[PDB]
PDB file of C-alpha atoms (C1' of nucleotides) in Angstrom:
ATOM      1  CA  UNK A   1      79.661  23.415 141.592  1.00  0.00           C
ATOM      2  CA  UNK A   2      76.467  23.214 143.660  1.00  0.00           C
ATOM      3  CA  UNK A   3      73.265  21.258 142.992  1.00  0.00           C
ATOM      4  CA  UNK A   4      70.395  23.708 143.449  1.00  0.00           C
ATOM      5  CA  UNK A   5      66.940  24.642 142.177  1.00  0.00           C
ATOM      6  CA  UNK A   6      66.349  28.257 141.143  1.00  0.00           C
ATOM      7  CA  UNK A   7      62.883  29.644 141.911  1.00  0.00           C
ATOM      8  CA  UNK A   8      61.647  32.690 140.047  1.00  0.00           C
ATOM      9  CA  UNK A   9      58.659  34.899 140.875  1.00  0.00           C
ATOM     10  CA  UNK A  10      57.892  37.166 137.918  1.00  0.00           C
ATOM     11  CA  UNK A  11      55.623  40.208 137.886  1.00  0.00           C
ATOM     12  CA  UNK A  12      55.163  43.314 135.802  1.00  0.00           C
ATOM     13  CA  UNK A  13      57.790  45.263 137.739  1.00  0.00           C
ATOM     14  CA  UNK A  14      59.677  42.661 139.760  1.00  0.00           C
ATOM     15  CA  UNK A  15      61.567  39.363 139.680  1.00  0.00           C
ATOM     16  CA  UNK A  16      62.312  37.578 142.944  1.00  0.00           C
ATOM     17  CA  UNK A  17      64.787  34.727 142.798  1.00  0.00           C
ATOM     18  CA  UNK A  18      65.860  32.050 145.245  1.00  0.00           C
ATOM     19  CA  UNK A  19      68.468  29.295 145.185  1.00  0.00           C
ATOM     20  CA  UNK A  20      67.867  26.127 147.176  1.00  0.00           C
ATOM     21  CA  UNK A  21      70.566  23.470 147.338  1.00  0.00           C
ATOM     22  CA  UNK A  22      68.943  20.056 147.010  1.00  0.00           C
ATOM     23  CA  UNK A  23      69.843  16.482 147.945  1.00  0.00           C
ATOM     24  CA  UNK A  24      71.538  14.044 145.641  1.00  0.00           C
ATOM     25  CA  UNK A  25      67.994  12.598 145.502  1.00  0.00           C
ATOM     26  CA  UNK A  26      66.465  16.039 144.639  1.00  0.00           C
ATOM     27  CA  UNK A  27      65.341  17.185 148.096  1.00  0.00           C
ATOM     28  CA  UNK A  28      66.003  20.711 149.427  1.00  0.00           C
ATOM     29  CA  UNK A  29      68.528  20.949 152.259  1.00  0.00           C
ATOM     30  CA  UNK A  30      70.118  24.412 152.183  1.00  0.00           C
ATOM     31  CA  UNK A  31      68.889  27.927 151.363  1.00  0.00           C
ATOM     32  CA  UNK A  32      71.851  29.467 149.535  1.00  0.00           C
ATOM     33  CA  UNK A  33      71.087  32.875 148.024  1.00  0.00           C
ATOM     34  CA  UNK A  34      68.026  34.983 147.269  1.00  0.00           C
ATOM     35  CA  UNK A  35      67.427  38.409 145.794  1.00  0.00           C
ATOM     36  CA  UNK A  36      64.898  40.794 144.288  1.00  0.00           C
ATOM     37  CA  UNK A  37      65.252  42.726 141.023  1.00  0.00           C
ATOM     38  CA  UNK A  38      62.889  45.659 140.486  1.00  0.00           C
ATOM     39  CA  UNK A  39      62.501  47.773 137.354  1.00  0.00           C
ATOM     40  CA  UNK A  40      60.004  50.198 135.859  1.00  0.00           C
ATOM     41  CA  UNK A  41      57.171  48.409 134.104  1.00  0.00           C
ATOM     42  CA  UNK A  42      57.045  48.780 130.339  1.00  0.00           C
ATOM     43  CA  UNK A  43      54.116  51.165 129.987  1.00  0.00           C
ATOM     44  CA  UNK A  44      53.362  54.833 130.564  1.00  0.00           C
ATOM     45  CA  UNK A  45      52.357  54.504 134.222  1.00  0.00           C
ATOM     46  CA  UNK A  46      49.184  56.579 134.603  1.00  0.00           C
ATOM     47  CA  UNK A  47      47.466  55.885 131.272  1.00  0.00           C
ATOM     48  CA  UNK A  48      48.734  52.545 129.989  1.00  0.00           C
ATOM     49  CA  UNK A  49      50.050  54.151 126.817  1.00  0.00           C
ATOM     50  CA  UNK A  50      53.156  52.624 125.337  1.00  0.00           C
ATOM     51  CA  UNK A  51      56.540  54.154 126.046  1.00  0.00           C
ATOM     52  CA  UNK A  52      57.134  54.406 122.288  1.00  0.00           C
ATOM     53  CA  UNK A  53      53.841  56.226 121.614  1.00  0.00           C
ATOM     54  CA  UNK A  54      55.101  59.722 122.500  1.00  0.00           C
ATOM     55  CA  UNK A  55      58.153  59.232 120.272  1.00  0.00           C
ATOM     56  CA  UNK A  56      56.102  57.986 117.302  1.00  0.00           C
ATOM     57  CA  UNK A  57      53.701  60.923 117.682  1.00  0.00           C
ATOM     58  CA  UNK A  58      56.599  63.385 117.772  1.00  0.00           C
TER      59      UNK A  58
ATOM     60  C1'   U B   1      51.691  46.837 120.962  1.00  0.00           C
ATOM     61  C1'   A B   2      55.607  47.876 117.154  1.00  0.00           C
ATOM     62  C1'   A B   3      54.884  50.731 111.727  1.00  0.00           C
ATOM     63  C1'   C B   4      52.047  54.668 108.005  1.00  0.00           C
ATOM     64  C1'   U B   5      49.833  59.245 104.248  1.00  0.00           C
ATOM     65  C1'   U B   6      47.541  63.809 105.092  1.00  0.00           C
ATOM     66  C1'   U B   7      44.321  67.504 107.170  1.00  0.00           C
ATOM     67  C1'   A B   8      42.967  70.980 110.806  1.00  0.00           C
ATOM     68  C1'   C B   9      44.205  73.525 115.294  1.00  0.00           C
ATOM     69  C1'   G B  10      47.094  75.422 119.255  1.00  0.00           C
ATOM     70  C1'   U B  11      51.877  78.056 120.918  1.00  0.00           C
ATOM     71  C1'   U B  12      55.603  81.730 120.006  1.00  0.00           C
ATOM     72  C1'   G B  13      57.958  85.599 116.889  1.00  0.00           C
ATOM     73  C1'   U B  14      57.259  89.243 113.001  1.00  0.00           C
ATOM     74  C1'   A B  15      53.915  92.454 109.412  1.00  0.00           C
ATOM     75  C1'   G B  16      49.131  95.042 108.211  1.00  0.00           C
ATOM     76  C1'   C B  17      44.286  96.620 110.071  1.00  0.00           C
ATOM     77  C1'   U B  18      41.819  96.673 114.909  1.00  0.00           C
ATOM     78  C1'   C B  19      39.359  96.795 120.760  1.00  0.00           C
ATOM     79  C1'   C B  20      40.788  98.826 125.050  1.00  0.00           C
ATOM     80  C1'   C B  21      44.090 101.486 127.840  1.00  0.00           C
ATOM     81  C1'   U B  22      49.140 103.454 131.541  1.00  0.00           C
ATOM     82  C1'   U B  23      52.102 107.515 131.450  1.00  0.00           C
ATOM     83  C1'   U B  24      54.204 111.939 128.424  1.00  0.00           C
ATOM     84  C1'   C B  25      53.053 115.964 124.322  1.00  0.00           C
ATOM     85  C1'   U B  26      49.873 119.469 122.263  1.00  0.00           C
ATOM     86  C1'   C B  27      44.866 121.941 122.318  1.00  0.00           C
ATOM     87  C1'   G B  28      40.613 123.561 124.919  1.00  0.00           C
ATOM     88  C1'   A B  29      37.127 127.642 130.999  1.00  0.00           C
ATOM     89  C1'   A B  30      35.352 121.002 131.806  1.00  0.00           C
ATOM     90  C1'   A B  31      34.345 117.055 128.723  1.00  0.00           C
ATOM     91  C1'   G B  32      37.712 115.438 125.397  1.00  0.00           C
ATOM     92  C1'   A B  33      40.431 115.411 119.935  1.00  0.00           C
ATOM     93  C1'   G B  34      44.624 114.139 118.036  1.00  0.00           C
ATOM     94  C1'   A B  35      49.391 112.277 118.947  1.00  0.00           C
ATOM     95  C1'   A B  36      54.567 109.197 121.002  1.00  0.00           C
ATOM     96  C1'   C B  37      56.768 104.735 123.490  1.00  0.00           C
ATOM     97  C1'   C B  38      54.961 100.495 125.450  1.00  0.00           C
ATOM     98  C1'   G B  39      51.267  97.180 126.885  1.00  0.00           C
ATOM     99  C1'   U B  40      47.799  94.548 124.764  1.00  0.00           C
ATOM    100  C1'   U B  41      42.052  92.685 122.377  1.00  0.00           C
ATOM    101  C1'   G B  42      40.492  90.665 117.775  1.00  0.00           C
ATOM    102  C1'   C B  43      41.026  89.158 112.092  1.00  0.00           C
ATOM    103  C1'   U B  44      44.464  87.883 108.357  1.00  0.00           C
ATOM    104  C1'   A B  45      49.443  86.524 106.613  1.00  0.00           C
ATOM    105  C1'   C B  46      54.391  84.522 107.017  1.00  0.00           C
ATOM    106  C1'   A B  47      58.247  81.873 109.859  1.00  0.00           C
ATOM    107  C1'   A B  48      59.265  78.125 113.572  1.00  0.00           C
ATOM    108  C1'   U B  49      56.947  73.925 115.731  1.00  0.00           C
ATOM    109  C1'   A B  50      61.646  69.614 120.257  1.00  0.00           C
ATOM    110  C1'   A B  51      66.456  71.470 122.006  1.00  0.00           C
ATOM    111  C1'   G B  52      69.756  69.657 117.575  1.00  0.00           C
ATOM    112  C1'   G B  53      72.171  67.070 113.115  1.00  0.00           C
ATOM    113  C1'   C B  54      72.555  65.568 107.756  1.00  0.00           C
ATOM    114  C1'   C B  55      72.198  63.621 102.590  1.00  0.00           C
ATOM    115  C1'   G B  56      71.108  62.762  97.229  1.00  0.00           C
ATOM    116  C1'   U B  57      71.182  64.872  92.073  1.00  0.00           C
ATOM    117  C1'   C B  58      72.681  68.500  88.360  1.00  0.00           C
ATOM    118  C1'   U B  59      76.867  72.950  86.499  1.00  0.00           C
ATOM    119  C1'   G B  60      81.573  74.024  88.487  1.00  0.00           C
ATOM    120  C1'   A B  61      88.911  72.798  89.661  1.00  0.00           C
ATOM    121  C1'   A B  62      86.910  73.754  93.762  1.00  0.00           C
ATOM    122  C1'   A B  63      84.221  77.844  96.279  1.00  0.00           C
ATOM    123  C1'   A B  64      79.582  77.947  95.931  1.00  0.00           C
ATOM    124  C1'   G B  65      75.120  78.001  93.028  1.00  0.00           C
ATOM    125  C1'   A B  66      70.748  75.166  91.209  1.00  0.00           C
ATOM    126  C1'   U B  67      67.800  71.366  93.052  1.00  0.00           C
ATOM    127  C1'   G B  68      64.221  67.204  95.763  1.00  0.00           C
ATOM    128  C1'   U B  69      56.956  63.127  96.340  1.00  0.00           C
ATOM    129  C1'   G B  70      64.820  64.413 100.479  1.00  0.00           C
ATOM    130  C1'   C B  71      66.511  62.025 105.675  1.00  0.00           C
ATOM    131  C1'   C B  72      67.334  61.432 111.231  1.00  0.00           C
ATOM    132  C1'   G B  73      66.427  63.254 116.430  1.00  0.00           C
ATOM    133  C1'   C B  74      61.805  61.785 123.412  1.00  0.00           C
ATOM    134  C1'   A B  75      61.308  54.006 122.292  1.00  0.00           C
ATOM    135  C1'   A B  76      62.259  48.898 122.985  1.00  0.00           C
ATOM    136  C1'   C B  77      65.778  45.192 122.962  1.00  0.00           C
ATOM    137  C1'   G B  78      70.774  43.708 122.529  1.00  0.00           C
ATOM    138  C1'   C B  79      76.395  43.263 123.210  1.00  0.00           C
ATOM    139  C1'   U B  80      78.622  42.244 116.545  1.00  0.00           C
ATOM    140  C1'   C B  81      81.448  47.116 116.607  1.00  0.00           C
ATOM    141  C1'   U B  82      82.863  51.632 119.733  1.00  0.00           C
ATOM    142  C1'   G B  83      82.979  54.154 124.901  1.00  0.00           C
ATOM    143  C1'   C B  84      82.778  54.189 130.485  1.00  0.00           C
ATOM    144  C1'   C B  85      82.817  51.166 134.661  1.00  0.00           C
ATOM    145  C1'   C B  86      83.515  46.225 137.367  1.00  0.00           C
ATOM    146  C1'   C B  87      85.824  41.450 137.866  1.00  0.00           C
ATOM    147  C1'   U B  88      89.227  37.077 136.942  1.00  0.00           C
ATOM    148  C1'   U B  89      93.833  35.313 135.191  1.00  0.00           C
ATOM    149  C1'   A B  90      99.020  35.734 132.889  1.00  0.00           C
ATOM    150  C1'   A B  91     103.335  38.703 132.364  1.00  0.00           C
ATOM    151  C1'   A B  92     106.432  43.079 133.519  1.00  0.00           C
ATOM    152  C1'   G B  93     107.583  47.077 136.615  1.00  0.00           C
ATOM    153  C1'   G B  94      98.724  45.630 148.488  1.00  0.00           C
ATOM    154  C1'   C B  95     100.170  50.593 143.495  1.00  0.00           C
ATOM    155  C1'   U B  96     100.819  50.861 137.882  1.00  0.00           C
ATOM    156  C1'   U B  97     100.526  48.951 133.112  1.00  0.00           C
ATOM    157  C1'   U B  98      99.612  45.425 129.468  1.00  0.00           C
ATOM    158  C1'   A B  99      97.281  41.160 127.340  1.00  0.00           C
ATOM    159  C1'   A B 100      93.580  37.618 127.256  1.00  0.00           C
ATOM    160  C1'   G B 101      88.982  36.388 129.118  1.00  0.00           C
ATOM    161  C1'   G B 102      84.261  37.372 131.487  1.00  0.00           C
ATOM    162  C1'   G B 103      80.434  40.897 132.638  1.00  0.00           C
ATOM    163  C1'   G B 104      77.155  45.765 133.827  1.00  0.00           C
ATOM    164  C1'   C B 105      75.628  49.977 131.494  1.00  0.00           C
ATOM    165  C1'   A B 106      75.486  53.492 127.467  1.00  0.00           C
ATOM    166  C1'   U B 107      77.034  59.008 124.708  1.00  0.00           C
ATOM    167  C1'   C B 108      77.568  51.951 121.113  1.00  0.00           C
ATOM    168  C1'   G B 109      74.698  48.442 117.958  1.00  0.00           C
ATOM    169  C1'   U B 110      69.723  46.659 115.584  1.00  0.00           C
ATOM    170  C1'   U B 111      64.548  47.727 114.313  1.00  0.00           C
ATOM    171  C1'   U B 112      66.238  52.561 111.083  1.00  0.00           C
ATOM    172  C1'   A B 113      65.273  55.574 106.148  1.00  0.00           C
TER     173        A B 113
END
RNA sequence: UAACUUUACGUUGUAGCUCCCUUUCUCGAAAGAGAACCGUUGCUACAAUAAGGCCGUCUGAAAAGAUGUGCCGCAACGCUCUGCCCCUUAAAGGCUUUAAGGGGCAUCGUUUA
């Protein structure tokens, strides 16, 4: 029900998101909601092996 | 990057031989020689190699036998199914239940046999 642009910042272990409500003419007027979502990055951390590798070996 | 077929080790447990050696026997004026339990060095063999769970075929009413280039098990992603949790709404007795609907996660699904 709100006219807003969603900005995403993506990295190997993080996604930051922001919502900015914009004008009728597409100009930003209000900062609505922002958050950060962090996860574990999809590799064996020290060596860069794949997470699946240990399972395939076994 | 996801997917293979095998080899060869290593680890542990058990068997034979073996290197040491702690105590306890027996001998012997010492030194030791042989022994018993255990420890454990080395060589060889077998079993297991995630912890756990299954199938196919043949003879049998079945029990079970026989049998095999037998199968899965540490991941990723997803919500079709199933489970837990969260929410919205409707109905009936802020409490409880039900239904529908929408999600998160998985002990659920797919890759996958």
